[PDB]
């Protein structure tokens, strides 16, 4: 069964736009999104659809690129580091839930390397 997906707005939380956050949407997210291995990560895990009934029994901080994209579009983040942490949670969740060598893990590993390449250099203020 599915929990509610992660919030993409929160009126208590202050919003911000920065050059680095703009870059994380326009270049980092939008490039990863087109990668051949992006599809498992483009939306919250649907434990019923994907027949992973234990997914949210194991993963307690779910994250996915659909959520990240919406957060960036909504100026939900205060800074780039917060957004980068969401990407890192997404990757680490995949490694936690699965096992080394699994096809889905090979997919996450290729995306993570590409992500690291793209955030190696970020715009300045
Ligand atoms: C094929 C299979 O049996 C799978 C296993 C052992 N694991 C995942 C799987 N584990 C994940 C963890 C996170 N955190 C995010 C996405 C993940 N997909 C899938 C899978 C199921 C349906 C479609 C694609 C892959």
Short mmCIF file of N, CA, C and O and ligand atoms in Angstrom, two decimals:
data_model
loop_
_atom_site.label_atom_id
_atom_site.label_comp_id
_atom_site.label_asym_id
_atom_site.label_seq_id
_atom_site.Cartn_x
_atom_site.Cartn_y
_atom_site.Cartn_z
N UNK A 1 0.83 -1.20 0.00
CA UNK A 1 0.00 0.00 0.00
C UNK A 1 0.87 1.26 0.00
O UNK A 1 2.05 1.22 0.40
N UNK A 2 0.29 2.37 -0.47
CA UNK A 2 1.04 3.59 -0.73
C UNK A 2 0.77 4.64 0.32
O UNK A 2 -0.40 4.89 0.67
N UNK A 3 1.80 5.26 0.85
CA UNK A 3 1.62 6.45 1.66
C UNK A 3 1.37 7.64 0.77
O UNK A 3 1.55 7.55 -0.46
N UNK A 4 0.96 8.78 1.32
CA UNK A 4 0.93 10.00 0.52
C UNK A 4 2.32 10.31 0.00
O UNK A 4 3.33 10.03 0.67
N UNK A 5 2.42 10.88 -1.19
CA UNK A 5 3.73 11.22 -1.75
C UNK A 5 4.34 12.38 -0.99
O UNK A 5 3.65 13.10 -0.25
N UNK A 6 5.64 12.62 -1.14
CA UNK A 6 6.27 13.73 -0.42
C UNK A 6 5.65 15.06 -0.83
O UNK A 6 5.20 15.22 -1.97
N UNK A 7 5.61 16.01 0.12
CA UNK A 7 5.06 17.32 -0.19
C UNK A 7 5.88 18.00 -1.28
O UNK A 7 7.10 17.81 -1.39
N UNK A 8 5.20 18.79 -2.12
CA UNK A 8 5.88 19.64 -3.08
C UNK A 8 5.63 21.12 -2.81
O UNK A 8 6.12 21.96 -3.57
N UNK A 9 4.88 21.43 -1.76
CA UNK A 9 4.66 22.78 -1.26
C UNK A 9 4.51 22.67 0.24
O UNK A 9 4.08 21.63 0.76
N UNK A 10 4.83 23.73 0.95
CA UNK A 10 4.60 23.77 2.38
C UNK A 10 4.59 25.23 2.78
O UNK A 10 5.64 25.89 2.75
N UNK A 11 3.44 25.79 3.15
CA UNK A 11 3.37 27.23 3.42
C UNK A 11 4.14 27.68 4.64
O UNK A 11 4.38 28.89 4.77
N UNK A 12 4.50 26.79 5.56
CA UNK A 12 5.34 27.17 6.68
C UNK A 12 6.79 27.39 6.27
O UNK A 12 7.48 28.21 6.87
N UNK A 13 7.22 26.72 5.24
CA UNK A 13 8.61 26.70 4.82
C UNK A 13 8.89 27.87 3.89
O UNK A 13 8.13 28.09 2.94
N UNK A 14 9.97 28.65 4.09
CA UNK A 14 10.23 29.77 3.18
C UNK A 14 10.75 29.27 1.84
O UNK A 14 11.37 28.21 1.75
N UNK A 15 10.47 30.04 0.80
CA UNK A 15 10.83 29.68 -0.56
C UNK A 15 12.06 30.47 -0.97
O UNK A 15 12.36 31.52 -0.41
N UNK A 16 12.75 29.99 -1.99
CA UNK A 16 13.85 30.80 -2.51
C UNK A 16 14.14 30.37 -3.93
O UNK A 16 13.88 29.23 -4.32
N UNK A 17 14.67 31.31 -4.70
CA UNK A 17 15.23 31.04 -6.01
C UNK A 17 16.68 31.51 -6.00
O UNK A 17 16.98 32.60 -5.49
N UNK A 18 17.57 30.69 -6.53
CA UNK A 18 18.97 31.04 -6.66
C UNK A 18 19.43 30.60 -8.04
O UNK A 18 18.78 29.78 -8.70
N UNK A 19 20.59 31.12 -8.47
CA UNK A 19 21.16 30.67 -9.73
C UNK A 19 21.42 29.17 -9.73
O UNK A 19 21.18 28.49 -10.73
N UNK A 20 21.91 28.65 -8.61
CA UNK A 20 22.18 27.22 -8.52
C UNK A 20 20.90 26.40 -8.58
O UNK A 20 20.87 25.36 -9.24
N UNK A 21 19.83 26.85 -7.92
CA UNK A 21 18.57 26.11 -8.01
C UNK A 21 17.99 26.16 -9.42
O UNK A 21 17.48 25.15 -9.90
N UNK A 22 18.11 27.30 -10.10
CA UNK A 22 17.65 27.36 -11.49
C UNK A 22 18.39 26.35 -12.34
O UNK A 22 17.79 25.66 -13.18
N UNK A 23 19.70 26.25 -12.13
CA UNK A 23 20.55 25.31 -12.85
C UNK A 23 20.17 23.87 -12.53
O UNK A 23 20.11 23.02 -13.42
N UNK A 24 19.84 23.60 -11.27
CA UNK A 24 19.45 22.24 -10.90
C UNK A 24 18.20 21.79 -11.64
O UNK A 24 18.06 20.61 -11.95
N UNK A 25 17.29 22.72 -11.94
CA UNK A 25 16.11 22.34 -12.71
C UNK A 25 16.42 22.27 -14.20
O UNK A 25 16.22 21.23 -14.84
N UNK A 26 16.97 23.36 -14.74
CA UNK A 26 17.05 23.52 -16.19
C UNK A 26 18.07 22.58 -16.80
O UNK A 26 17.86 22.05 -17.90
N UNK A 27 19.18 22.34 -16.12
CA UNK A 27 20.22 21.48 -16.64
C UNK A 27 20.28 20.13 -15.92
O UNK A 27 20.23 19.09 -16.57
N UNK A 28 20.40 20.12 -14.59
CA UNK A 28 20.67 18.84 -13.93
C UNK A 28 19.46 17.92 -14.03
O UNK A 28 19.55 16.82 -14.58
N UNK A 29 18.32 18.36 -13.50
CA UNK A 29 17.14 17.50 -13.52
C UNK A 29 16.71 17.21 -14.94
O UNK A 29 16.43 16.06 -15.29
N UNK A 30 16.65 18.23 -15.78
CA UNK A 30 16.07 18.02 -17.10
C UNK A 30 16.96 17.15 -17.98
O UNK A 30 16.45 16.46 -18.87
N UNK A 31 18.27 17.14 -17.72
CA UNK A 31 19.15 16.22 -18.44
C UNK A 31 19.04 14.79 -17.91
O UNK A 31 18.88 13.86 -18.70
N UNK A 32 19.12 14.60 -16.59
CA UNK A 32 18.92 13.26 -16.02
C UNK A 32 17.59 12.67 -16.46
O UNK A 32 17.49 11.46 -16.71
N UNK A 33 16.56 13.51 -16.56
CA UNK A 33 15.22 13.03 -16.91
C UNK A 33 15.21 12.31 -18.24
O UNK A 33 14.41 11.38 -18.43
N UNK A 34 16.09 12.70 -19.18
CA UNK A 34 16.13 12.12 -20.52
C UNK A 34 16.99 10.88 -20.62
O UNK A 34 17.00 10.23 -21.67
N UNK A 35 17.74 10.56 -19.57
CA UNK A 35 18.59 9.38 -19.59
C UNK A 35 17.74 8.13 -19.74
O UNK A 35 16.61 8.04 -19.24
N UNK A 36 18.29 7.14 -20.43
CA UNK A 36 17.56 5.91 -20.69
C UNK A 36 17.15 5.19 -19.41
O UNK A 36 16.16 4.44 -19.43
N UNK A 37 17.86 5.41 -18.31
CA UNK A 37 17.56 4.76 -17.04
C UNK A 37 16.76 5.66 -16.09
O UNK A 37 16.65 5.34 -14.90
N UNK A 38 16.19 6.76 -16.58
CA UNK A 38 15.48 7.68 -15.70
C UNK A 38 14.11 7.16 -15.28
O UNK A 38 13.64 7.49 -14.18
N UNK A 39 13.46 6.33 -16.10
CA UNK A 39 12.04 6.04 -15.88
C UNK A 39 11.66 5.51 -14.50
O UNK A 39 10.57 5.87 -14.02
N UNK A 40 12.44 4.66 -13.81
CA UNK A 40 11.99 4.20 -12.49
C UNK A 40 11.96 5.30 -11.47
O UNK A 40 11.34 5.14 -10.41
N UNK A 41 12.59 6.43 -11.78
CA UNK A 41 12.82 7.50 -10.82
C UNK A 41 12.03 8.76 -11.13
O UNK A 41 12.22 9.78 -10.45
N UNK A 42 11.15 8.73 -12.11
CA UNK A 42 10.43 9.92 -12.56
C UNK A 42 9.16 10.18 -11.75
O UNK A 42 8.50 11.21 -11.99
N UNK A 43 8.81 9.31 -10.82
CA UNK A 43 7.60 9.46 -10.03
C UNK A 43 7.80 8.70 -8.73
O UNK A 43 8.61 7.78 -8.67
N UNK A 44 7.04 9.04 -7.69
CA UNK A 44 7.10 8.25 -6.45
C UNK A 44 6.86 6.77 -6.75
O UNK A 44 6.05 6.42 -7.61
N UNK A 45 7.54 5.90 -6.01
CA UNK A 45 7.29 4.46 -6.12
C UNK A 45 5.83 4.15 -5.82
O UNK A 45 5.29 4.53 -4.77
N UNK A 46 5.16 3.48 -6.75
CA UNK A 46 3.80 3.02 -6.53
C UNK A 46 3.94 1.55 -6.15
O UNK A 46 4.13 0.69 -7.01
N UNK A 47 3.85 1.29 -4.85
CA UNK A 47 4.11 -0.05 -4.34
C UNK A 47 3.09 -1.05 -4.85
O UNK A 47 3.41 -2.23 -5.00
N UNK A 48 1.85 -0.61 -5.12
CA UNK A 48 0.85 -1.51 -5.68
C UNK A 48 1.13 -1.79 -7.15
O UNK A 48 1.22 -2.94 -7.58
N UNK A 49 1.27 -0.72 -7.94
CA UNK A 49 1.56 -0.86 -9.37
C UNK A 49 2.78 -1.75 -9.59
O UNK A 49 2.72 -2.73 -10.34
N UNK A 50 3.89 -1.44 -8.92
CA UNK A 50 5.15 -2.13 -9.16
C UNK A 50 5.27 -3.44 -8.39
O UNK A 50 6.34 -4.07 -8.47
N UNK A 51 4.23 -3.87 -7.68
CA UNK A 51 4.25 -5.10 -6.88
C UNK A 51 5.46 -5.15 -5.96
O UNK A 51 6.22 -6.12 -5.94
N UNK A 52 5.64 -4.06 -5.21
CA UNK A 52 6.68 -3.94 -4.19
C UNK A 52 5.99 -3.64 -2.87
O UNK A 52 6.15 -2.54 -2.31
N UNK A 53 5.23 -4.59 -2.34
CA UNK A 53 4.39 -4.27 -1.18
C UNK A 53 5.18 -3.91 0.05
O UNK A 53 4.62 -3.31 0.97
N UNK A 54 6.47 -4.20 0.08
CA UNK A 54 7.29 -3.86 1.23
C UNK A 54 8.10 -2.59 1.03
O UNK A 54 8.91 -2.24 1.90
N UNK A 55 7.90 -1.88 -0.08
CA UNK A 55 8.78 -0.75 -0.37
C UNK A 55 8.79 0.25 0.77
O UNK A 55 9.86 0.65 1.26
N UNK A 56 7.61 0.69 1.21
CA UNK A 56 7.51 1.70 2.26
C UNK A 56 7.57 1.09 3.65
O UNK A 56 7.63 1.83 4.65
N UNK A 57 7.61 -0.24 3.75
CA UNK A 57 8.00 -0.86 5.00
C UNK A 57 9.49 -0.67 5.27
O UNK A 57 9.91 -0.66 6.43
N UNK A 58 10.29 -0.52 4.21
CA UNK A 58 11.73 -0.38 4.33
C UNK A 58 12.18 1.07 4.16
O UNK A 58 13.02 1.56 4.92
N UNK A 59 11.63 1.77 3.17
CA UNK A 59 12.06 3.12 2.83
C UNK A 59 11.15 4.13 3.52
O UNK A 59 9.97 4.25 3.19
N UNK A 60 11.72 4.90 4.46
CA UNK A 60 10.93 5.82 5.26
C UNK A 60 11.12 7.26 4.86
O UNK A 60 10.39 8.13 5.35
N UNK A 61 12.07 7.55 3.98
CA UNK A 61 12.25 8.90 3.44
C UNK A 61 12.26 8.79 1.92
O UNK A 61 13.30 9.01 1.28
N UNK A 62 11.12 8.46 1.31
CA UNK A 62 11.12 8.28 -0.15
C UNK A 62 11.39 9.59 -0.87
O UNK A 62 11.10 10.68 -0.37
N UNK A 63 12.01 9.50 -2.04
CA UNK A 63 12.22 10.67 -2.87
C UNK A 63 12.39 10.20 -4.31
O UNK A 63 12.86 9.08 -4.55
N UNK A 64 12.01 11.06 -5.25
CA UNK A 64 12.01 10.73 -6.67
C UNK A 64 12.15 12.02 -7.45
O UNK A 64 11.94 13.12 -6.92
N UNK A 65 12.51 11.90 -8.73
CA UNK A 65 12.74 13.09 -9.54
C UNK A 65 11.46 13.84 -9.90
O UNK A 65 11.55 15.03 -10.22
N UNK A 66 10.31 13.17 -9.92
CA UNK A 66 9.07 13.90 -10.14
C UNK A 66 8.80 14.86 -9.01
O UNK A 66 8.50 16.04 -9.24
N UNK A 67 8.99 14.39 -7.78
CA UNK A 67 8.88 15.25 -6.61
C UNK A 67 9.90 16.37 -6.65
O UNK A 67 9.57 17.54 -6.38
N UNK A 68 11.15 16.05 -7.00
CA UNK A 68 12.19 17.07 -7.03
C UNK A 68 11.86 18.12 -8.07
O UNK A 68 11.99 19.33 -7.83
N UNK A 69 11.45 17.69 -9.26
CA UNK A 69 11.08 18.63 -10.31
C UNK A 69 10.00 19.59 -9.83
O UNK A 69 10.10 20.81 -10.03
N UNK A 70 8.96 19.06 -9.19
CA UNK A 70 7.87 19.90 -8.71
C UNK A 70 8.34 20.85 -7.62
O UNK A 70 7.93 22.01 -7.58
N UNK A 71 9.20 20.37 -6.72
CA UNK A 71 9.78 21.24 -5.71
C UNK A 71 10.55 22.39 -6.36
O UNK A 71 10.37 23.55 -5.98
N UNK A 72 11.39 22.09 -7.33
CA UNK A 72 12.12 23.15 -8.02
C UNK A 72 11.18 24.12 -8.73
O UNK A 72 11.36 25.34 -8.65
N UNK A 73 10.15 23.60 -9.41
CA UNK A 73 9.20 24.46 -10.10
C UNK A 73 8.46 25.37 -9.14
O UNK A 73 8.11 26.51 -9.49
N UNK A 74 8.25 24.92 -7.91
CA UNK A 74 7.51 25.64 -6.90
C UNK A 74 8.40 26.53 -6.01
O UNK A 74 7.87 27.25 -5.16
N UNK A 75 9.71 26.54 -6.24
CA UNK A 75 10.67 27.25 -5.39
C UNK A 75 10.61 26.79 -3.95
O UNK A 75 10.80 27.57 -3.01
N UNK A 76 10.40 25.48 -3.77
CA UNK A 76 10.21 24.89 -2.46
C UNK A 76 11.49 24.92 -1.63
O UNK A 76 11.44 24.97 -0.40
N UNK A 77 12.65 24.83 -2.28
CA UNK A 77 13.92 24.71 -1.59
C UNK A 77 14.48 26.07 -1.20
O UNK A 77 14.25 27.07 -1.87
N UNK A 78 15.23 26.09 -0.10
CA UNK A 78 15.99 27.29 0.26
C UNK A 78 17.29 27.39 -0.52
O UNK A 78 17.71 28.49 -0.90
N UNK A 79 17.95 26.26 -0.79
CA UNK A 79 19.23 26.33 -1.48
C UNK A 79 19.49 25.05 -2.26
O UNK A 79 18.80 24.04 -2.11
N UNK A 80 20.53 25.12 -3.10
CA UNK A 80 20.90 23.98 -3.93
C UNK A 80 21.25 22.77 -3.09
O UNK A 80 20.95 21.64 -3.48
N UNK A 81 21.93 22.97 -1.96
CA UNK A 81 22.31 21.84 -1.13
C UNK A 81 21.09 21.03 -0.71
O UNK A 81 21.13 19.80 -0.67
N UNK A 82 19.99 21.71 -0.40
CA UNK A 82 18.78 21.00 0.00
C UNK A 82 18.27 20.12 -1.14
O UNK A 82 17.81 19.00 -0.92
N UNK A 83 18.33 20.64 -2.37
CA UNK A 83 17.88 19.88 -3.52
C UNK A 83 18.82 18.71 -3.80
O UNK A 83 18.38 17.58 -4.04
N UNK A 84 20.13 18.96 -3.74
CA UNK A 84 21.11 17.89 -3.90
C UNK A 84 20.89 16.78 -2.88
O UNK A 84 21.01 15.60 -3.20
N UNK A 85 20.51 17.14 -1.64
CA UNK A 85 20.24 16.12 -0.64
C UNK A 85 19.07 15.24 -1.05
O UNK A 85 19.07 14.03 -0.79
N UNK A 86 18.05 15.82 -1.70
CA UNK A 86 16.94 15.01 -2.19
C UNK A 86 17.38 14.02 -3.26
O UNK A 86 16.95 12.87 -3.25
N UNK A 87 18.22 14.46 -4.21
CA UNK A 87 18.78 13.51 -5.17
C UNK A 87 19.54 12.40 -4.47
O UNK A 87 19.39 11.22 -4.81
N UNK A 88 20.35 12.75 -3.49
CA UNK A 88 21.14 11.74 -2.79
C UNK A 88 20.26 10.77 -2.02
O UNK A 88 20.53 9.56 -2.01
N UNK A 89 19.20 11.27 -1.39
CA UNK A 89 18.23 10.38 -0.76
C UNK A 89 17.63 9.41 -1.77
O UNK A 89 17.50 8.21 -1.50
N UNK A 90 17.24 9.93 -2.94
CA UNK A 90 16.67 9.07 -3.98
C UNK A 90 17.63 7.93 -4.34
O UNK A 90 17.22 6.76 -4.39
N UNK A 91 18.89 8.25 -4.62
CA UNK A 91 19.84 7.21 -4.98
C UNK A 91 20.03 6.22 -3.83
O UNK A 91 19.97 5.00 -4.03
N UNK A 92 20.27 6.74 -2.62
CA UNK A 92 20.55 5.86 -1.49
C UNK A 92 19.35 4.97 -1.18
O UNK A 92 19.55 3.80 -0.82
N UNK A 93 18.12 5.47 -1.35
CA UNK A 93 16.95 4.62 -1.17
C UNK A 93 17.00 3.42 -2.10
O UNK A 93 16.64 2.30 -1.70
N UNK A 94 17.40 3.63 -3.35
CA UNK A 94 17.49 2.53 -4.30
C UNK A 94 18.51 1.50 -3.84
O UNK A 94 18.26 0.29 -3.90
N UNK A 95 19.67 1.96 -3.36
CA UNK A 95 20.70 1.05 -2.86
C UNK A 95 20.23 0.32 -1.61
O UNK A 95 20.51 -0.87 -1.43
N UNK A 96 19.49 1.01 -0.74
CA UNK A 96 19.01 0.39 0.50
C UNK A 96 17.99 -0.69 0.19
O UNK A 96 18.07 -1.82 0.72
N UNK A 97 17.00 -0.37 -0.64
CA UNK A 97 15.91 -1.30 -0.91
C UNK A 97 16.36 -2.53 -1.70
O UNK A 97 15.80 -3.61 -1.51
N UNK A 98 17.36 -2.38 -2.57
CA UNK A 98 17.73 -3.47 -3.46
C UNK A 98 19.06 -4.10 -3.02
O UNK A 98 19.46 -4.00 -1.85
N UNK A 99 19.72 -4.80 -3.93
CA UNK A 99 21.01 -5.39 -3.60
C UNK A 99 22.02 -5.03 -4.67
O UNK A 99 21.65 -4.71 -5.80
N UNK A 100 23.32 -5.04 -4.34
CA UNK A 100 24.33 -4.74 -5.35
C UNK A 100 24.18 -5.68 -6.53
O UNK A 100 23.93 -6.88 -6.38
N UNK A 101 24.34 -5.12 -7.72
CA UNK A 101 24.23 -5.86 -8.93
C UNK A 101 22.85 -5.94 -9.53
O UNK A 101 22.73 -6.33 -10.69
N UNK A 102 21.79 -5.62 -8.77
CA UNK A 102 20.44 -5.66 -9.32
C UNK A 102 20.35 -4.67 -10.48
O UNK A 102 21.00 -3.62 -10.47
N UNK A 103 19.53 -5.02 -11.48
CA UNK A 103 19.38 -4.13 -12.63
C UNK A 103 18.99 -2.72 -12.20
O UNK A 103 19.52 -1.73 -12.73
N UNK A 104 18.04 -2.60 -11.26
CA UNK A 104 17.61 -1.27 -10.87
C UNK A 104 18.75 -0.49 -10.22
O UNK A 104 18.83 0.74 -10.35
N UNK A 105 19.64 -1.19 -9.51
CA UNK A 105 20.80 -0.55 -8.89
C UNK A 105 21.79 -0.09 -9.95
O UNK A 105 22.36 0.99 -9.83
N UNK A 106 22.02 -0.90 -10.99
CA UNK A 106 22.88 -0.45 -12.09
C UNK A 106 22.31 0.81 -12.73
O UNK A 106 23.06 1.71 -13.13
N UNK A 107 20.99 0.90 -12.79
CA UNK A 107 20.35 2.09 -13.34
C UNK A 107 20.61 3.30 -12.45
O UNK A 107 21.04 4.36 -12.93
N UNK A 108 20.35 3.17 -11.15
CA UNK A 108 20.64 4.25 -10.21
C UNK A 108 22.12 4.65 -10.26
O UNK A 108 22.43 5.84 -10.22
N UNK A 109 23.02 3.68 -10.34
CA UNK A 109 24.45 3.99 -10.35
C UNK A 109 24.84 4.84 -11.56
O UNK A 109 25.66 5.76 -11.46
N UNK A 110 24.27 4.53 -12.73
CA UNK A 110 24.56 5.33 -13.92
C UNK A 110 24.00 6.73 -13.78
O UNK A 110 24.64 7.71 -14.18
N UNK A 111 22.80 6.85 -13.22
CA UNK A 111 22.22 8.18 -13.01
C UNK A 111 23.02 8.97 -12.00
O UNK A 111 23.24 10.18 -12.17
N UNK A 112 23.47 8.32 -10.92
CA UNK A 112 24.23 9.03 -9.90
C UNK A 112 25.54 9.56 -10.44
O UNK A 112 25.95 10.70 -10.13
N UNK A 113 26.24 8.77 -11.25
CA UNK A 113 27.47 9.28 -11.86
C UNK A 113 27.19 10.50 -12.73
O UNK A 113 27.94 11.48 -12.69
N UNK A 114 26.13 10.45 -13.54
CA UNK A 114 25.78 11.59 -14.37
C UNK A 114 25.43 12.80 -13.51
O UNK A 114 25.87 13.92 -13.78
N UNK A 115 24.66 12.58 -12.44
CA UNK A 115 24.32 13.64 -11.51
C UNK A 115 25.58 14.28 -10.92
O UNK A 115 25.72 15.51 -10.89
N UNK A 116 26.51 13.45 -10.45
CA UNK A 116 27.75 13.99 -9.90
C UNK A 116 28.51 14.81 -10.93
O UNK A 116 29.05 15.87 -10.62
N UNK A 117 28.58 14.31 -12.17
CA UNK A 117 29.23 15.07 -13.24
C UNK A 117 28.63 16.46 -13.36
O UNK A 117 29.35 17.46 -13.50
N UNK A 118 27.29 16.54 -13.33
CA UNK A 118 26.63 17.80 -13.61
C UNK A 118 26.72 18.77 -12.45
O UNK A 118 26.74 19.99 -12.67
N UNK A 119 26.82 18.28 -11.21
CA UNK A 119 26.95 19.19 -10.08
C UNK A 119 28.39 19.43 -9.70
O UNK A 119 28.65 20.20 -8.76
N UNK A 120 29.33 18.83 -10.41
CA UNK A 120 30.74 19.08 -10.16
C UNK A 120 31.04 20.57 -10.19
O UNK A 120 31.79 21.09 -9.36
N UNK A 121 30.43 21.28 -11.14
CA UNK A 121 30.56 22.73 -11.24
C UNK A 121 29.16 23.32 -11.33
O UNK A 121 28.40 22.99 -12.25
N UNK A 122 28.84 24.20 -10.40
CA UNK A 122 27.57 24.90 -10.39
C UNK A 122 27.82 26.37 -10.69
O UNK A 122 28.90 26.89 -10.40
N UNK A 123 26.83 27.09 -11.22
CA UNK A 123 26.96 28.54 -11.35
C UNK A 123 27.25 29.19 -10.00
O UNK A 123 26.95 28.65 -8.93
N UNK A 124 27.86 30.37 -10.07
CA UNK A 124 28.08 31.21 -8.91
C UNK A 124 26.91 32.18 -8.73
O UNK A 124 26.09 32.37 -9.63
N UNK A 125 26.85 32.80 -7.56
CA UNK A 125 25.89 33.87 -7.31
C UNK A 125 26.22 35.09 -8.15
O UNK A 125 25.38 35.97 -8.32
C1 LIG B 1 12.27 -5.57 -11.29
C2 LIG B 1 12.28 -5.75 -9.80
O1 LIG B 1 11.99 -6.82 -9.30
C3 LIG B 1 12.68 -4.58 -8.95
C4 LIG B 1 13.55 -4.68 -7.74
C5 LIG B 1 14.15 -5.94 -7.17
N1 LIG B 1 13.70 -3.43 -7.23
C6 LIG B 1 13.03 -2.53 -7.98
C7 LIG B 1 13.10 -1.07 -7.56
N2 LIG B 1 13.63 -0.85 -6.35
C8 LIG B 1 13.62 0.48 -6.19
C9 LIG B 1 14.02 1.27 -5.17
C10 LIG B 1 13.87 2.63 -5.30
N3 LIG B 1 14.30 3.29 -4.23
C11 LIG B 1 13.33 3.25 -6.44
C12 LIG B 1 12.91 2.49 -7.51
C13 LIG B 1 13.09 1.12 -7.41
N4 LIG B 1 12.75 0.07 -8.22
C14 LIG B 1 12.33 -3.14 -9.14
C15 LIG B 1 11.48 -2.53 -10.19
C16 LIG B 1 10.13 -2.86 -10.22
C17 LIG B 1 9.31 -2.31 -11.20
C18 LIG B 1 9.85 -1.43 -12.13
C19 LIG B 1 11.20 -1.11 -12.11
C20 LIG B 1 12.02 -1.67 -11.13
#
